[PDB]
């Protein structure tokens, strides 16, 4: 017998109270209109004309107010969501900015200048429907059980589906019809996405890029980057007898061609590349910040780029000749995208377009002028931004020429068939892959996903895995910084990459540090490093959403801190025993020691998909061994929202489970508390809904017993 | 039958680890009648079916054996005089494989190699040691061709057929009799069937194009029926014999084995209107008006 | 690979023995046994899976592959070549499946759902390729089959 605590089932409601099921869709927007709206503002703040350098614009601050409507004339009154849903209006609020323009000779600072409108969420912080009471919710004709999270544009409910994509700033090593090939996709904060690939054929490496015409040997690029001596090249590649025998052809090919100096290498690159200012300068600028944008250069030093390319060559060497390849179905690398980043790109593009438009309308009026004062307020319109936002949300065709991207089918009409179909629409996630019959891996159930995406929840038909839903316990990490992280890393004793040479990285004891696809440096004793980092994370100095893992096959530590990662809370164990005791849960039952206090007292912690790869997790408490590091809170959390309505899911078969998950959103029943007031296109009601006798804990968690869609017979 | 023919490897077990596609892919390749076939398997029988030592002797005959795998060790010796490459042929590995390759056989295989070499500086020192001196001419120095001849010495085949890749012998048992059947994985049947070991009379192939090139067009209509029936009995289904006999005679009456593709359908039928739906925007439609052929409505 | 098949047949013997011992203890009035004997809708494998044990959940005729680091699930150990660890289900449908066993049973559920959902496209390609080829082959009145020409 082992001391068991049958009280950890009340941790899940306390965790769902703060965030979880549908609140993250609102946190993605609340953090967006408080940080990213200011980020794009400080991005583009000063614009100047070209006629005479005396006129210029400045921005002081920008913010968004409350949902308002402009009626007949000079009347701004608070509008209700049901009012817009009945009048086929659009739920939006104006954007108030503080502008500064210099007309004539003096400077004018006109505060509170309206430049446009912007939609507001139904349950956001700026909306009215927040922090209210059910008695007050009934006064506004709105269902209190409505989870929200959709957009109201022209009297329809539109939801933006979460879309998964591949991670950027990383090296992939795949296999194709010829052999093995390495690739690197890079996308920085500014608008430039690149995809370079190293290919191998008849024992000769070649580099391919979109702006390059023909393939160029990697040794030529090495000599062009700045490393002159050919010995240091092989030294950086790898200190091994079998990696040197595979690098011989490249060396003899570089020796065959009359290329021995950096100038000759740059001349060869200029002759090879075609762009539609001499050849040396364009070849130098093409290698600086064009092929790899995620690796910054201080002035003209290609040392870090050389190190990264050497690690890439060593990776493609260790891959070739073995049976190890990297697959894209791994969910530890695949990232998620909510409605926040799409709106960020859209708003940035619209703001840049608006700044470039007025710059062009006021440049041919200053020379051909008839007055001495030119006001920019009269030559200003606020209809383009609102029209663009409304059309982008309604149509759902994200078209961004500045980013050079076109996407269709992102926003969908919120299905109001039942109470489960409406909530289940908010948890739906679509993939970027098209309707391809040939692909079967991504559609197939992957061992990587465990408690993050419900396996049973999937549509039956053509889409047999492309559409997935989230689990009950799931959290998406937001964006953060890297200053304190790199500071603590340098204080731990990490060595700089500019000090050691190429022969040290081949040493087995030597370990490399990777941070968001960037080589931080070299460190010894990585175990103590990871231990101290985890201790500091449990302390409270560094944020809790920082992932750190190690790879012994590649001999490097990965530090992931970018936004859009998957994590679920796990209980910590102390060498034979869970830290959570009965006295800690009695206080939670009392009303104190919430989830925040538990996270601050080093009781539970979040883990990533790749972070749980380097740890042992126990299902129950009787299975806990001496090697387990974390403990599962509840095992019934793996099932999804539509899968929580099936009595005894383990007793039933997976095809029947999937069928019932698909038919649960098809059953008709009660929609909400105000179904006679709302007027939708098609609506179904039942007469006398009964209550399920054998209910589930998930039913009570969502309070499905108040709006059942069936009857006992 | 093809509707319910979408399952995975059926007779999968550790007894026979042989990757042979059977299902809708095999039927699709048979209907398409493509030249290049996937996973070639070709079976032959021996004259001596009692002794297994003869089977092991003739197994090494039809098999592509390289020089580097048989060579004990190769080394480059450098001295004040001209350097040369030295390879030590191991006789024990030849005796264990029961091969009939001697030092003169290696010399003749090297002189008949594809890389630039002529019998001027290639000699045998003793029993199973070969010395090759590279020349200094016509491309570059001898140092660069030295690295070029050391990585192709294993590539130079010493015996066998370059077409055949892998061979294994299968044991058949009965009431009291034992049989040994030699199945190899290649394409050139004309070379394996014309061998002293395997009996050329009793030998079956899988490539329809190669078996109609070697045996004939009339002998290809029989092997295309057996492969189809062998795929239908592997699924637990049953078709009639003349149903597939009529399909085998449909691509055998006019010329050679014609496949059911977009190009073969134009050779079978001569109607532009039915090809209008198969092909693209306006190519055939304008070439028809250019040439001016008469379409028969039948 | 030799060891993967040596223990694969030892896990089937216990299942077959349980299924055969269940038949001697069953009554001659059970509806499932009656339907299996008649053959209307069911089989003996379903009875042995619902009563005795499920068996082994194989994927593409192989064992459950690893997905994190040389291990299928993170709840197991490193390089754990154990039957119950990799893909072996022990409890039947009546008793109750383990979440790890439920995941392995659901893994085989989707592999069979995706091979019939896309099979319509290949079957339609082959049907159009075969129909357009043979649409005029008929028999004449002199016991001879000819073409349209």
């Amino acid at each position: 017998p082992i001391p068991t605590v049958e009280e950890k089932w009340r941790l899940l409601p306390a965790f769902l109270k703060v965030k979880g099921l549908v609140k993250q869709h609102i946190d993605s927007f609340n953090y967006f209109i408080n940080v990213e709206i200011k980020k794009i503002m400080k991005a583009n703040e000063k614009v100047t004309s070209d006629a005479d350098p005396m006129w210029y614009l400045k921005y002081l601050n920008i913010y968004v107010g409350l949902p308002d409507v402009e009626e007949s004339f000079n009347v701004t009154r608070p509008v209700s969501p049901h009012e817009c849903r009945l009048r086929d209006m659009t739920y939006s609020a104006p954007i108030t900015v503080d502008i500064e323009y210099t007309r004539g000779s003096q400077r004018i600072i006109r505060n509170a200048l309206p430049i446009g409108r912007m939609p507001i969420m139904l349950r956001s912080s700026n909306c009215v429907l927040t922090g209210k009471t059910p008695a007050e919710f009934a006064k506004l004709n709105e269902c209190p059980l409505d989870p929200g999270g959709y957009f109201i544009v022209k009297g329809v409910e539109k939801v933006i589906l979460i879309q998964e994509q591949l991670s950027k700033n990383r090296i992939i090593v795949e296999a194709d019809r010829k052999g093995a090939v390495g690739a690197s996709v890079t996308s920085s904060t500014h608008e430039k996405k690149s995809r370079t690939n190293m290919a191998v054929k008849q024992g000769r490496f070649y580099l391919r890029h979109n702006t390059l015409s023909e393939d160029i040997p990697i040794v030529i690029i090495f000599k062009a980057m700045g490393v002159e001596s050919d010995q240091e090249i092989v030294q950086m590649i790898g200190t091994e007898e079998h990696v040197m025998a595979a690098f011989g052809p490249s060396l003899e090919e570089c020796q065959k061609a009359q290329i021995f100096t950096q100038m000759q290498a740059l001349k060869y690159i200029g002759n090879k590349v075609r762009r539609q200012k001499t050849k040396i300068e364009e070849a130098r600028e093409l290698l600086a910040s064009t092929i790899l944008t995620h690796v910054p250069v201080k002035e003209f030093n290609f040392r870090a780029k050389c190190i990264y390319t050497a690690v890439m060559v060593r990776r493609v060497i260790l891959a070739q000749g073995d049976n190890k390849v990297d697959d894209r179905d791994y969910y530890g690398n695949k990232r998620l995208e909510l409605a926040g980043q799409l709106l960020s790109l859209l708003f940035e593009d619209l703001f840049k377009k608006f700044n470039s438009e007025m710059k062009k309308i006021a440049d041919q009026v200053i020379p051909k002028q008839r007055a001495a004062q030119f006001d920019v307020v009269k030559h200003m319109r606020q209809d383009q931004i609102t029209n663009g936002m409304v059309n982008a949300i309604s149509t759902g065709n994200w078209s961004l020429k500045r980013f050079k991207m076109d996407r269709q089918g992102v926003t969908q009409v919120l299905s109001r068939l039942s109470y489960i179909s409406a909530l289940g629409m908010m948890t739906r996630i679509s993939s970027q892959f098209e309707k391809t019959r040939k692909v079967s891996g991504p559609r197939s159930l992957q061992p990587s996903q465990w408690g993050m995406l419900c396996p049973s929840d999937t549509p039956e038909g053509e889409a047999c895995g492309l559409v997935k839903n989230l689990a009950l316990m799931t959290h998406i990490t937001t964006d953060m910084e890297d200053g304190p992280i790199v500071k603590l890393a340098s204080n731990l004793g990490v060595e700089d990459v500019n000090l050691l040479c190429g022969e040290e990285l081949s040493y087995p004891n030597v370990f490399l540090v990777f941070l968001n696809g960037n080589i931080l440096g070299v460190i010894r004793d990585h175990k103590k490093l990871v231990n101290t980092f985890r201790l500091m994370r449990r302390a409270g100095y560094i944020n809790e959403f920082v992932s750190i893992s190690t790879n012994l096959t590649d001999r490097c530590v990965y530090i992931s801190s970018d936004g859009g990662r998957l994590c679920r809370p796990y209980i910590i164990v102390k060498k034979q025993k869970p830290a959570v005791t009965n006295k800690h849960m009695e206080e939670l039952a009392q009303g104190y020691r919430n989830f925040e206090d538990f996270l601050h007292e080093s009781l539970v912690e979040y883990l990533d998909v790749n972070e749980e790869n380097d740890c042992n997790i126990a299902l129950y408490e009787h299975t806990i061994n001496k090697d387990t590091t974390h403990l599962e809170i509840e095992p019934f959390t793996l099932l999804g929202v539509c899968a929580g309505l099936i009595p005894y899911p383990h007793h039933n078969q997976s095809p029947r489970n999937t069928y019932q998950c698909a038919m649960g959103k098809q059953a008709m029943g009660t929609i909400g508390y105000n179904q006679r007031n709302r007027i939708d296109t098609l609506m179904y009601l039942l007469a006398y809904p009964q209550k399920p006798m054998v209910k589930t804990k998930t039913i009570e968690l969502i309070e499905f017993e108040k709006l059942p869609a069936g009857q006992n017979a | 039958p093809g509707t319910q023919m979408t399952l995975k490897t059926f007779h999968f077990a550790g007894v026979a680890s042989m990757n042979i596609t059977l299902g809708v892919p095999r039927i699709k390749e048979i209907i398409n009648a493509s030249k290049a076939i996937s996973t070639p398997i070709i079976t032959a029988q021996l004259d001596k079916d009692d002794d297994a030592d003869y089977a092991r002797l003739v197994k090494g005959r039809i098999e592509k054996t390289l020089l580097g795998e048989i060579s004990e060790y190769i080394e480059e010796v450098f001295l004040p005089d001209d350097c040369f490459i030295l390879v030590k042929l191991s006789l024990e590995r030849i005796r264990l494989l029961r091969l009939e390759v001697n030092a003169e056989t290696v010399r003749y295989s090297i002189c008949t190699s594809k890389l630039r070499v002529k019998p001027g500086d290639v000699a045998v020192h003793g029993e199973a040691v070969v010395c090759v001196t590279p020349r200094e001419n016509s491309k570059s120095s001898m140092y660069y061709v030295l690295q070029f001849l050391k990585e192709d010495l294993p590539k130079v085949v010493v015996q066998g057929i370059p077409e055949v890749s892998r061979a294994v012998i299968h044991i058949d048992e009965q009431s009291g009799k034992e049989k040994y059947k030699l199945l190899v994985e290649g394409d050139n049947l004309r070379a394996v069937m014309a061998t002293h070991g395997v009996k050329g009379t009793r030998t079956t192939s899988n490539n329809t194009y190669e078996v109609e090139k070697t045996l004939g067009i009339e002998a290809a209509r029989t092997t295309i029926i057996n492969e189809i029936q062998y795929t239908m009995v592997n699924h637990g289904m049953s078709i009639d014999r003349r149903h597939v006999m009529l399909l085998s005679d449909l691509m055998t009456y006019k010329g050679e084995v014609l496949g059911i593709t977009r190009f073969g359908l134009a050779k079978m039928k001569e109607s532009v209107l039915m090809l209008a739906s198969f092909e693209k925007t306006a190519d055939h439609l304008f070439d028809a008006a250019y040439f001016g052929q008469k379409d028969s409505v039948c | 690979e030799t060891l993967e098949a040596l223990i694969l047949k030892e896990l089937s013997v216990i299942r077959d023995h349980a299924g055969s011992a269940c038949l001697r203890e069953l009554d001659k009035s059970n509806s499932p046994l009656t339907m299996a004997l008649c053959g209307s809708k069911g089989s003996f494998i379903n009875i042995s899976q619902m009563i005795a044990c499920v068996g082994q959940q194989a994927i593409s005729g192989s064992r459950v592959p690893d997905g994190f680091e040389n291990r299928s699930l993170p709840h197991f150990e490193k390089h754990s070549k154990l039957p119950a660890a990799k893909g072996f289900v022990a409890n039947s449908f009546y008793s109750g499946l383990t979440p790890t066993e439920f995941f392995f049973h659901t893994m085989a559920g989707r592999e069979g759902l995706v091979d019939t959902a896309v099979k319509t496209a290949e079957t339609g390609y082959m049907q159009r390729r075969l129909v357009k080829s043979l649409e005029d082959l008929c028999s004449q009145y002199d016991l001879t089959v000819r073409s349209s020409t």
């Binding site: 009409v413 919120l414 299905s415 109001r416 068939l417 019959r437 040939k438 549509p459 038909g461 053509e462 959103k665 098809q666 296109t681 098609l682 | 493509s34 030249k35 593709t261 977009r262 190009f263 198969f278 | 959902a117 319509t120 496209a121 079957t123 339609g124 390609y125 049907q127 159009r128």
Partner: peptide, 30 residues
């Protein structure tokens, strides 16, 4: 004979259309 793909070359017919019913709720004539 060129190495083409059946999917992109042969355009989808009524054969390819898999008639299956799913919930997907929510020209001049004389």
């Amino acid at each position: 004979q060129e190495e083409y793909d059946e999917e992109e070359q042969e355009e989808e017919n009524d054969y390819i259309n898999s008639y299956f019913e799913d919930g997907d709720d929510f020209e001049a004539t004389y």
